[PDB]
Symmetry: C2
Subunit: 46 residues, 2 copies
């Protein structure tokens, strides 16, 4: 891919992690966080 | 800002909209979608 599409992907990953952090603090079930954000369990752990 | 940080911001906005769309289909209350994703009501409408 291009550098622009790589930078957009970094932003998507950054936003998904931030949303997941909020959901974690609000008590959302972890299986739902993974469904909504697309993140792996090791991404949630780190 | 720089072009890299603008491109990352476009990715963050794209991912927030996608997550919001999933949450909408799953019946999440709209006030919660807005809290988790940071989106405005007009961003959810469009």
């Amino acid at each position: 891919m291009t550098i622009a599409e790589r930078l957009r992907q970094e932003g998507e990953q950054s936003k998904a992690l931030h949303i997941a952090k909020i959901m974690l603090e609000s008590g959302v079930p972890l299986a739902d966080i993974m469904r909504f954000t697309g993140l792996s369990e090791e991404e949630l752990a780190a």
